[PDB]
Amino acid sequence: VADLKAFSKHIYNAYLKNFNMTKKKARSILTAPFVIHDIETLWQAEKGLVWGLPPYKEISVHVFYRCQCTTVETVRELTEFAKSIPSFSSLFLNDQVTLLKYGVHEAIFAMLASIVNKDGLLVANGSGFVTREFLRSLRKPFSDIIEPKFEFAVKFNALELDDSDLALFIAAIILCGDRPGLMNVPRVEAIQDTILRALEFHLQANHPDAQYLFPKLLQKMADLRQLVTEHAQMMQRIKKTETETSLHPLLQEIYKD
């Protein structure tokens, strides 16, 4: 219980040091950003009011490129976050990459819930708010990509986790010993079990009255697996049917499996 109070605080610092957008910062904004709800307001957002990119093609593809850019920026933040966990950094560099490779999207979808409400999501570091309605209005198969992440984000936010809960949840997602090609599995498993025990102790103190919060959270991790799988499946469809669209090499690398 004592080594676990310490551990949790250490991770919460790695979290606060490395992510530009916390749930605390986001909730206070969501309760002014510039609302992007159509082409005119998107054009206005670009021209200064909110914001290099691959050459212009069309609006649904443009949004698709901005999602990729945001995804990459978050992979960096997550990379720096993980490295800030001493036990992570003491793994072999090839194992670090394996964990990140299979972990990042699950983590990204987990953190998305922080910047989301029923109506849309905060973009460009809180400067803008893209409406969910506008994202459904994009042509197929681009409209299909973001919609399930929303569905998930609403159900997730109902658990009312704060940044210190998320810190440990994210760390658990990344330091997960079931990843294929993992070199030193027992070690990764050991570190995970510590994170999970820490998370669980932390949930008791931080949420005294919330029942079943820990097992519900574990189920959320299973859900994120299904989410990422379904994401990968859709990116295959874009790579095949939308050959004119281009995918950032780092995402190509991740989606490869």
Ligand X SMILES: O=C(Nc1ccccc1C(=O)O)c1cccc(S(=O)(=O)N2CCc3ccccc3C2)c1
Residues that bind a second copy in the complex, under the rule CB under 8 A: 79, 92-94, 96-97, 100-101, 183-184, 249-250, 253
**Minimum gap (Å) between residue 151 Cβ and a second copy:** 30
Q: Which does 96 bind (CB under 5 to 8 A by kind): ligand X, a second copy, none?
A: a second copy
| Distances, alpha carbon 256 to alpha carbons 83, 104, 131, 168, in Å | 24, 14, 31, 28
**Minimum gap (Å) between residue 217 Cβ and a second copy:** 27
The count of chain residues that interact with ligand X, using the rule CB under 6 A, is 19
Q: Residue 82: which residues within 8 A CB-CB, separation 6 or more?
A: 88, 96, 99, 100, 171, 174, 175
Pick from 16, 193, 163: which is nearest to 87 by CA?
193
Among 12, 102, 109, 169, binds ligand X (CB under 6 A): 109
Query: What does the DSSP assignment read for 71-121?
Result: HHHHHHHHHHHHHTSHHHHTS-HHHHHHHHHHHHHHHHHHHHGGGB-SSEE
**Minimum gap (Å) between residue 8 Cβ and ligand X:** 26
149 contributes a contact to ligand X by CB under 6 A: yes
**Minimum gap (Å) between residue 84 Cβ and a second copy:** 13
Which residues 110-139 are close enough to bind ligand X by CB under 6 A?
Answer: 112, 121, 123-124, 130, 135
Q: Which does 168 bind (CB under 5 to 8 A by kind): ligand X, a second copy, none?
A: none
Give the HSE-up count for residue 54: Cα atoms under 13 Å, Cβ half-sphere.
Answer: 18
78 contributes a contact to ligand X by CB under 6 A: no
